[PDB]
Each structure stands twice: as structure tokens, then as C-alpha cells.
Amino acid sequence: GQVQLVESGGGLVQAGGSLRLSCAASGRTFSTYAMGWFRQAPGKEREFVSACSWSGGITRYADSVKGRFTISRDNAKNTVYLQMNSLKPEDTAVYYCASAASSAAYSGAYYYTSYYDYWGQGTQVTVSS
Amino acid sequence: GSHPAGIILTRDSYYTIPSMEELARSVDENGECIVNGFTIGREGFGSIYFEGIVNLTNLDLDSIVHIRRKEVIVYVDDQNKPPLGEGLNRPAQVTLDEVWPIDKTSRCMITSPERLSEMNYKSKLENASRKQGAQFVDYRPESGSWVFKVNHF
Ligand code: NA
Incomplete structure (x- = not known):
């Protein structure tokens, strides 16, 4: 628990609309090598959404x-963002932000839930038809 | 007058197997460069071996492949990455050199095979491979050469 993550900004959005999620990181934040977003819809497994390196240079x-979602992070504020555009009902899920405290030996590491070490509690996104 | 396969690799520390000069001679009558097995490496840093039939035509390897200390990136920006199995987004064996544990209190690295075995460093690399979705293959302690297999980038 040396890094703590708290997501915010979830809500109800009409199909086609946009929503920006935020996450506040606390603790040994300079530990982080990567930030990611995952999501879990009812009855399905938690699945990869997006990730960037600490530097923000690899996505x-x-x-x-x-092409619909954009992850970003503000290292002045220790915040992570997910801009979600052209939303569809299949995007309805709890969205979790996560951070990895070890470096990615290869650029495919970012896809795996096991790669991440710290997790937020999640924020709910609901896209209406 | 660039490379006949359209492959871009200007960085002098990098190399390919087959060599860029052989690849120039491996283009079919339609301009396609297709090889059975392809390695791209960077001296002093590591290498990536792609088994099987690989189409290299017009690969900007300078843009795509970055082998840095203890890290490889294949496709930097995500939108430039092709679907699984296409281009270089496919199974490969990654070798990274000079992968040694750091003593953060003594700020020097532990590089002797004796000590690496004494501290079971190999099992750290096994767990780290699995943690990142890869399969540990080997560790050569003298050169700190960590080898692992990946399914994609
Ligand atoms: Na290799």
C-alpha cells in the first residue's frame, strides 16, 4: 500500500458523448513506472483499457x-486521466486506475493485470443508449 | 536510392539477422521482403528474435524498435502498432544484457555469478517474466543476459 489511488469522475453519459475520469495518486508516487486503466463490466472479467509509462511517452x-480514449497524467499534481470519447453502451463498467512499481521489460507488459501493483477502488461509468 | 526492401535502419548500434545487406537481396518480384526468422539487436544492449515467416517490407525499424538498457519497445505510439501477428507485433524471444540487481544501499550492482546464485537472482527474473505476461527462458549471469519469450508487444 505504498502508493494509493482514488478514481473519480464516473457517471451516466449518453451514447456518443464524452467523459473524463481522474485519479489522485498518493504516497511514493515517484515509484511508478506505468499507470493504467482497467474496467470490469457486470458478470465479466476485469479487462485492460489503457496505459502509459511514467514519462507519458509510450501508450x-x-x-x-x-482512437476513442486517451490516457494522460499530470506529474505536477500526481493525477492520472482517461478521456473517453464516442462512448458506447459496451463501455459501461467500473473503471479502475492502477500503477506499476517495476519497469516494463517489453512494451507488451502493460496489458497484464499482474504487471500492476497498486489499484484504486473504481468509479462507475454508465453509457445509456 | 534507399533500401530495396524499403526497410529503414540508420542507427549504427543496431543490426539485423539477416543483415540489412542480405535483406536488400531478399525481395520478391513484387517488392516484398519475406524471411523465415528475423533478429534485430543493438550491440551492448540486447536483441529480439522473431521466429517464423516475417514480412519486413517498408518497416521503419528506426521508428518501431527501441532496445534500451533493460527495456525493449516495439511500436512507441499505439496507433502505429498493427494487429497481432502482423509486422513485429507477434511472438518473439527478447534478450536483454546487463540485467543485474542493484544494491540501493551500496549504489553498485551485484554482477558475480557466485553472488547472483547466492541471492537466487534467477528466480527474481522468473517471477518478473511471469508478472509481465512473458515466459522466462534463461539467465546468463556473466553478461547479465535475461532471455524471455513474449506473445506480442
Ligand atoms: Na533473443
């Missing part, structure tokens, strides 16, 4: 959200 997205 990864799930195929389902490529």
Missing part, C-alpha cells in the same frame, strides 16, 4: 478503445 490501448 497502449485496448483494440476496443483505440
Whole structure:
């Protein structure tokens, strides 16, 4: 628990609309090598959404959200963001932000839940038809 | 007058197997460069071996592949990454050199095989491979060469 994450900004959005999620990181934040967003819809497993390196220079997205979602982070404020555009009802889920305290040996590491060490409690996104 | 396969690799520390010069001679009548097995490496840093039939035509390897200390990136920006199995987004064996534990209190690294075995460093690399979705393959302590297999980048 040396890093703590608290997400915010979830809510109800109409299909086609946009929503920006935020997450406040606390603790040994300079530990972080990567930040990611995951999501879990009812009855399904928790799944990768998006990730960036600490530097913000490398990014990864799930195929389902490529070009609609944008992760970013503000290291002055120790906050992480997920801009979600052109939302669809299939995007309805609890969204979790996560941080990895070890470096990615290869750029595919970002996709795996096991790679991340600290997790927020989640914020609910609901997209209406 | 660039490379006949359209492959871009100007960085002098990098190399390919087959060599860029062989790849120039491995282009079919339609301009496609197709090889059985492909390695890209960077001296002093590591290498990535892609098994199987690989189409290298017009790969900007300078943009795509970055082998740095204890890290490889294949496709920097996500939108430039092709689907699984295409280009270099496919299974590969990664070798990273000079992968040694740091004593953060003595700020020097432990590099002797004797000490690496005494501290079971190999099992740390096994767990780290699994943690990142990869399969540990080998560790050569003298060179700190961590080898692991990945399914994608
Ligand atoms: Na290799």
C-alpha cells in the first residue's frame, strides 16, 4: 500500500458523448513506472483499457478503445486521466486506475493485470443508449 | 536510392539477422521482403528474435524498435502498432544484457555469478517474466543476459 489511488469522475453519459475520469495518486508516487486503466463490466472479467509509462511517452490501448480514449497524467499534481470519447453502451463498467512499481521489460507488459501493483477502488461509468 | 526492401535502419548500434545487406537481396518480384526468422539487436544492449515467416517490407525499424538498457519497445505510439501477428507485433524471444540487481544501499550492482546464485537472482527474473505476461527462458549471469519469450508487444 505504498502508493494509493482514488478514481473519480464516473457517471451516466449518453451514447456518443464524452467523459473524463481522474485519479489522485498518493504516497511514493515517484515509484511508478506505468499507470493504467482497467474496467470490469457486470458478470465479466476485469479487462485492460489503457496505459502509459511514467514519462507519458509510450501508450497502449485496448483494440476496443483505440482512437476513442486517451490516457494522460499530470506529474505536477500526481493525477492520472482517461478521456473517453464516442462512448458506447459496451463501455459501461467500473473503471479502475492502477500503477506499476517495476519497469516494463517489453512494451507488451502493460496489458497484464499482474504487471500492476497498486489499484484504486473504481468509479462507475454508465453509457445509456 | 534507399533500401530495396524499403526497410529503414540508420542507427549504427543496431543490426539485423539477416543483415540489412542480405535483406536488400531478399525481395520478391513484387517488392516484398519475406524471411523465415528475423533478429534485430543493438550491440551492448540486447536483441529480439522473431521466429517464423516475417514480412519486413517498408518497416521503419528506426521508428518501431527501441532496445534500451533493460527495456525493449516495439511500436512507441499505439496507433502505429498493427494487429497481432502482423509486422513485429507477434511472438518473439527478447534478450536483454546487463540485467543485474542493484544494491540501493551500496549504489553498485551485484554482477558475480557466485553472488547472483547466492541471492537466487534467477528466480527474481522468473517471477518478473511471469508478472509481465512473458515466459522466462534463461539467465546468463556473466553478461547479465535475461532471455524471455513474449506473445506480442
Ligand atoms: Na533473443
